[PDB]
CSV table of C-alpha atoms and ligand atoms in Angstrom, one decimal:
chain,number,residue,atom,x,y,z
A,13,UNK,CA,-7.5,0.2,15.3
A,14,UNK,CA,-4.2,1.4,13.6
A,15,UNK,CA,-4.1,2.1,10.1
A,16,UNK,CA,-0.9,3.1,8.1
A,17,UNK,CA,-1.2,5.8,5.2
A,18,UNK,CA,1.4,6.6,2.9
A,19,UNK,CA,2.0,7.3,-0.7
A,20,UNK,CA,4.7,5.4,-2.8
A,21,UNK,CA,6.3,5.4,-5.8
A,22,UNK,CA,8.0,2.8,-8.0
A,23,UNK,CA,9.9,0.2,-5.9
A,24,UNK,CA,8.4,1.5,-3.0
A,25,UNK,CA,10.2,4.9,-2.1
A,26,UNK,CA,8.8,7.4,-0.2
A,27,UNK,CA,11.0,9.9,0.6
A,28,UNK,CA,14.8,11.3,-0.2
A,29,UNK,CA,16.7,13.7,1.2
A,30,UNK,CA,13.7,13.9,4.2
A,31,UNK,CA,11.4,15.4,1.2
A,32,UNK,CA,8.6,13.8,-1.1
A,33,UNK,CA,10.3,14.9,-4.4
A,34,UNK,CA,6.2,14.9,-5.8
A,35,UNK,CA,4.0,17.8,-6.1
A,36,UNK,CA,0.3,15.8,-6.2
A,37,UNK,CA,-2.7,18.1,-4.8
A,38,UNK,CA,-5.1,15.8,-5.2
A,39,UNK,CA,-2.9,12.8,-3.0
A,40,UNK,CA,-2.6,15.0,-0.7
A,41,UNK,CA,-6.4,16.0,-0.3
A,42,UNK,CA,-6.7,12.4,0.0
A,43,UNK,CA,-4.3,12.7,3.1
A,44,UNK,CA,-6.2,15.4,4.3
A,45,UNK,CA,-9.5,13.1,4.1
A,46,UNK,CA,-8.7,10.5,5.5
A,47,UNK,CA,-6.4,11.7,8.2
A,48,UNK,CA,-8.0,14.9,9.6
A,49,UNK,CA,-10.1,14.3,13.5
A,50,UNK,CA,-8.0,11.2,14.1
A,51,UNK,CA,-4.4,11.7,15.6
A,52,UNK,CA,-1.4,11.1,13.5
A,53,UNK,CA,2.0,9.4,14.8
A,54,UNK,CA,5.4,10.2,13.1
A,55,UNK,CA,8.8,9.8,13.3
A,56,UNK,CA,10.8,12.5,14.1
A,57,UNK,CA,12.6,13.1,10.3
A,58,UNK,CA,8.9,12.9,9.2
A,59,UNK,CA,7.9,15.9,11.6
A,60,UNK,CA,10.7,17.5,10.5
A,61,UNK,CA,10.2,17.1,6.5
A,62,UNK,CA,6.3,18.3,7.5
A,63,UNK,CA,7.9,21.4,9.1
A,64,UNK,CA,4.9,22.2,11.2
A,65,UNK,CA,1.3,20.9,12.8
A,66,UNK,CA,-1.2,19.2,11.0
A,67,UNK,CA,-4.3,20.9,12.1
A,68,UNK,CA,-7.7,19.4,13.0
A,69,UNK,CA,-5.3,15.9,14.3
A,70,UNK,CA,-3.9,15.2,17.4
A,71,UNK,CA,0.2,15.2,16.3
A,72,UNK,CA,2.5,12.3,18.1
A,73,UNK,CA,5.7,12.9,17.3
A,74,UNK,CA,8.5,9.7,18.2
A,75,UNK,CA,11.3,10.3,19.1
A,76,UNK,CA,14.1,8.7,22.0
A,77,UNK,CA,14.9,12.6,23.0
A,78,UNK,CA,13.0,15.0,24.5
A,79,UNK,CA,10.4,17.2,23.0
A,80,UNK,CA,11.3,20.4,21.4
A,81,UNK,CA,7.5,21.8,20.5
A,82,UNK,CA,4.9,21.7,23.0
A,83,UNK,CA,2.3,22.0,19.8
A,84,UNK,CA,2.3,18.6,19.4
A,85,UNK,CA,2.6,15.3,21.8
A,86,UNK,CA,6.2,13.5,22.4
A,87,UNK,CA,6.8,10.0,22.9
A,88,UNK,CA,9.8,7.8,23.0
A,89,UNK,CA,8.0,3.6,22.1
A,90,UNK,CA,5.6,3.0,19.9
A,91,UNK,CA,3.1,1.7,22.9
A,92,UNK,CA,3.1,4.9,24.4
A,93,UNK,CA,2.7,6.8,20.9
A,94,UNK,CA,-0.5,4.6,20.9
A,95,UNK,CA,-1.4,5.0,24.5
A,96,UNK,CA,-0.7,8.8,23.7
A,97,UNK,CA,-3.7,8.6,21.3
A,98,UNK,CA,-6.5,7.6,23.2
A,99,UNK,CA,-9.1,5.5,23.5
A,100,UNK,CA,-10.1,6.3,19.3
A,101,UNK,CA,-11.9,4.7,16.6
A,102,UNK,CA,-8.7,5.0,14.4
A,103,UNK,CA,-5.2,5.6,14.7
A,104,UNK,CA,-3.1,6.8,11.6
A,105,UNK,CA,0.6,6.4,11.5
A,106,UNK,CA,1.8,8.6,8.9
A,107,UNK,CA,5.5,7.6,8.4
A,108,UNK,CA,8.4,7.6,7.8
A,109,UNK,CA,10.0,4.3,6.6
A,110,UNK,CA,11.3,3.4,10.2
A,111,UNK,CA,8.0,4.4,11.8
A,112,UNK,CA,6.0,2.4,9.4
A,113,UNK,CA,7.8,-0.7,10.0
A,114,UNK,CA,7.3,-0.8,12.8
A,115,UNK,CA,3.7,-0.3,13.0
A,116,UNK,CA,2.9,-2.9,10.0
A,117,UNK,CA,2.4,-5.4,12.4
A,118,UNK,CA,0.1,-4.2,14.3
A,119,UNK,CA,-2.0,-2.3,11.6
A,120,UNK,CA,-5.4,-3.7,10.3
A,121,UNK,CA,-5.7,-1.1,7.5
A,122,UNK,CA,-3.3,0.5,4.8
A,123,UNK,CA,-4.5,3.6,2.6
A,124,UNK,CA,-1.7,3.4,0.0
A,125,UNK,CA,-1.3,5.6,-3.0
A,126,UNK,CA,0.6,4.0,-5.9
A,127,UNK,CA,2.2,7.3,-7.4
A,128,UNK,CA,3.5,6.0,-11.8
A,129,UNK,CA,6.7,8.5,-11.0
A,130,UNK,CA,10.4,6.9,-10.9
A,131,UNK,CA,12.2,8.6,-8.3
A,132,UNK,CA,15.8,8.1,-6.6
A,133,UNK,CA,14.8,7.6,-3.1
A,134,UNK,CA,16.4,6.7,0.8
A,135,UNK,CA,13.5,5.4,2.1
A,136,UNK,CA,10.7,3.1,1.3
A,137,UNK,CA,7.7,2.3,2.3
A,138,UNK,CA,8.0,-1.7,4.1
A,139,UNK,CA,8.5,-5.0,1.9
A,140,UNK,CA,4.9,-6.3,3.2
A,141,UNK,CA,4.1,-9.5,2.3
A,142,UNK,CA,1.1,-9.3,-0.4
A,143,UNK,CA,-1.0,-12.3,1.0
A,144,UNK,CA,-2.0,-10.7,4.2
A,145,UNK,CA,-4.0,-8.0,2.6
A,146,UNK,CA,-7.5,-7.7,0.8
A,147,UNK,CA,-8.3,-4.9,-1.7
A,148,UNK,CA,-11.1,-3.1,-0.7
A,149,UNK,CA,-11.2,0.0,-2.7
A,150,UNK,CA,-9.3,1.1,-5.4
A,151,UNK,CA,-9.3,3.9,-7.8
A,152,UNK,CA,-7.0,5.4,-10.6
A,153,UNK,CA,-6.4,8.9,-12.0
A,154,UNK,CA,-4.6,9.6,-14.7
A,155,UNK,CA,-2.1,12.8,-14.7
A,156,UNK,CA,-3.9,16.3,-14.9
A,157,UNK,CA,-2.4,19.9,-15.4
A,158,UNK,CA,-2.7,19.7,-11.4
A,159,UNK,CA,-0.6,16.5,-10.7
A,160,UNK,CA,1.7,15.5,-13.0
A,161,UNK,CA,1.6,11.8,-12.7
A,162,UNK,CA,-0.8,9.2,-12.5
A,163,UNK,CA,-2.0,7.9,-8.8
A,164,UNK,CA,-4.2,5.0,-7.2
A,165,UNK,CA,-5.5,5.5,-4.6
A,166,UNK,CA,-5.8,1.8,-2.5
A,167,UNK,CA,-7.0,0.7,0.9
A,168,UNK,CA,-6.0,-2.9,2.0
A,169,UNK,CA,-7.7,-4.7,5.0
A,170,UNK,CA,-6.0,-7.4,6.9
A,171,UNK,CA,-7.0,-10.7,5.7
U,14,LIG,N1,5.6,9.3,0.8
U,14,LIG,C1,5.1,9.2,2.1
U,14,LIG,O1,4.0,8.8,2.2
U,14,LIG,C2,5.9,9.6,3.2
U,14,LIG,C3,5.3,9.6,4.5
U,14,LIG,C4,6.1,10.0,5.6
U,14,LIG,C5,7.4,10.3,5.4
U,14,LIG,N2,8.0,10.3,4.2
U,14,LIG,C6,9.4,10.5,3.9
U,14,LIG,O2,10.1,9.5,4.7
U,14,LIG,C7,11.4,10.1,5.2
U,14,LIG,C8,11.5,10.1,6.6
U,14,LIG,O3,11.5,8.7,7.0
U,14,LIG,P1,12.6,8.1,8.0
U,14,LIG,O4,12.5,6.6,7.9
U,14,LIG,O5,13.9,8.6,7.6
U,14,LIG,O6,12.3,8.6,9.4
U,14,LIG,P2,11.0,8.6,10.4
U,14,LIG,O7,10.5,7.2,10.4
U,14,LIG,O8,10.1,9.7,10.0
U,14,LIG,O9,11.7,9.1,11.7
U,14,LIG,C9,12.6,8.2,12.4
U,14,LIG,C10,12.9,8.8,13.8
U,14,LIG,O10,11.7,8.6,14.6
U,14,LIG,C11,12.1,8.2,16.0
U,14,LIG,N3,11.7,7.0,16.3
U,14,LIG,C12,11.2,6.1,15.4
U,14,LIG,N4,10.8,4.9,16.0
U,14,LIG,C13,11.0,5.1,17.3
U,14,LIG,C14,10.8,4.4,18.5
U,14,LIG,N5,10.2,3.1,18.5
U,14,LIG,N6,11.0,4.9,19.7
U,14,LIG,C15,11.5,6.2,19.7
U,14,LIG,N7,11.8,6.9,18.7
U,14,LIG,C16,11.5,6.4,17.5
U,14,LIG,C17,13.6,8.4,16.0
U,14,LIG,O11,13.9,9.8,16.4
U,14,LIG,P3,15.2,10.0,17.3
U,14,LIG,O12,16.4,10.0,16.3
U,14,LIG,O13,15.0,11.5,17.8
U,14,LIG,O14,15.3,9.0,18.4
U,14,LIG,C18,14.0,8.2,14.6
U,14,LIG,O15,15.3,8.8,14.1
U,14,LIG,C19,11.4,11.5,4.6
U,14,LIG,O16,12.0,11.5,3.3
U,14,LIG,C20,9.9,11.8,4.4
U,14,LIG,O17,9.7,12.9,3.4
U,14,LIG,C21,7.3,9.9,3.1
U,15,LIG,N1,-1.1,9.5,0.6
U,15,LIG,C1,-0.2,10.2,1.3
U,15,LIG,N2,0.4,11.3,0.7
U,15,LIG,C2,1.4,12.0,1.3
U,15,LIG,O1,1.9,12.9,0.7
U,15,LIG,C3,1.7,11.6,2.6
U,15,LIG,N3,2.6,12.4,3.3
U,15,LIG,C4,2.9,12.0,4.5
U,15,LIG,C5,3.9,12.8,5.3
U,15,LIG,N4,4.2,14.2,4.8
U,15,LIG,C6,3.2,15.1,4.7
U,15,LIG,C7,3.6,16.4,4.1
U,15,LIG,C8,2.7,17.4,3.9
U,15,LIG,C9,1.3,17.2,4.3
U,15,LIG,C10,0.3,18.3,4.2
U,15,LIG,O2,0.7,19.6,4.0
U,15,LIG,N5,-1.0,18.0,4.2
U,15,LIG,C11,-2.0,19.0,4.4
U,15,LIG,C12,-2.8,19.1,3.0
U,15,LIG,C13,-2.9,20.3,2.2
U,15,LIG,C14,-4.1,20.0,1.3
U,15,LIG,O3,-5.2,19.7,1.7
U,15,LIG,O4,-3.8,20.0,0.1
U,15,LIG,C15,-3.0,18.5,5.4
U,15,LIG,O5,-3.7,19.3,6.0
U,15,LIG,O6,-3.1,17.3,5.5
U,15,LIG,C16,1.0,16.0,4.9
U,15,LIG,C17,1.9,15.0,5.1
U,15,LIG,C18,2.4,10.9,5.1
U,15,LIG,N6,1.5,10.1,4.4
U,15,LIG,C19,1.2,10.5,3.2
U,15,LIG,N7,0.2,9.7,2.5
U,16,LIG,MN1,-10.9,-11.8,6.9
């Protein structure tokens, strides 16, 4: 199954200037969680922003070029970034906006982070309609001397 994880502030944005502009250890422990043994598929700007591997994942890396790290796996559709993973239990696409679009539709799971920060983005995570998914688990934090907003972490299942 395909899964998308991702962590959003208000109105949705992820990223600008290919950079989270956040600094939250614990979301990204959650990342870490719920992302290491299963391969992870990116977009290009996303590998980039990351600046390295993730270890303990198989890395698939999109892009319509050719490969410039043979440290991680290149593909150029996103049926052969999922052929590229394997017959799995669990696929997680791990961004960015463009990447995550495109993978909605064929994802049965979101882990989603709702991060209380107001920040000026360029990209956001996709409009998706609310009706398609169930809340399964949710759980809030409030701001520590750690992370310096408040966070929830969700997981939504396709109805
Ligand atoms: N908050 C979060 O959870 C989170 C998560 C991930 C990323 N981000 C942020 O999101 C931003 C990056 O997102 P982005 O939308 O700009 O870029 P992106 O989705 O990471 O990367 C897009 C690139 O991936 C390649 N690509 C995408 N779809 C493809 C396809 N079907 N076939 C072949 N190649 C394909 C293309 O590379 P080529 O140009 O080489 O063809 C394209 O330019 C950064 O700010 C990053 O920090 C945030
Ligand atoms: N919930 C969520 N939070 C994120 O920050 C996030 N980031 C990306 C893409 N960018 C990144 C940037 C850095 C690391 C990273 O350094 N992760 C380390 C964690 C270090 C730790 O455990 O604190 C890792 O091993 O996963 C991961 C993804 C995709 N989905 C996300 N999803
Ligand atoms: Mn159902």
């Amino acid at each position: 199954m395909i899964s998308l994880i991702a962590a959003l502030a208000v109105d949705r944005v992820i990223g600008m200037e290919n950079a989270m502009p956040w600094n939250l250890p614990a979301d990204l422990a959650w990342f870490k969680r719920n992302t290491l043994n299963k391969p992870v598929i990116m977009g290009r700007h996303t590998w980039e922003s990351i600046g390295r591997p993730l270890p303990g994942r198989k890395n698939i890396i999109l892009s319509s070029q050719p490969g410039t790290d043979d440290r991680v796996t290149w593909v150029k559709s996103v049926d052969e970034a999922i052929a590229a993973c394997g017959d799995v239990p669990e696929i997680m696409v791990i961004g960015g906006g463009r990447v995550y679009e495109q993978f909605l539709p064929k994802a049965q799971k979101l882990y989603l982070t709702h991060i209380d920060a107001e920040v000026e983005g360029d990209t956001h995570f996709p409009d998706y309609e609310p009706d398609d998914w169930e809340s399964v688990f949710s759980e809030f934090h409030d701001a520590d001397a750690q992370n310096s907003h408040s966070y929830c972490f969700e997981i939504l299942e396709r109805r």
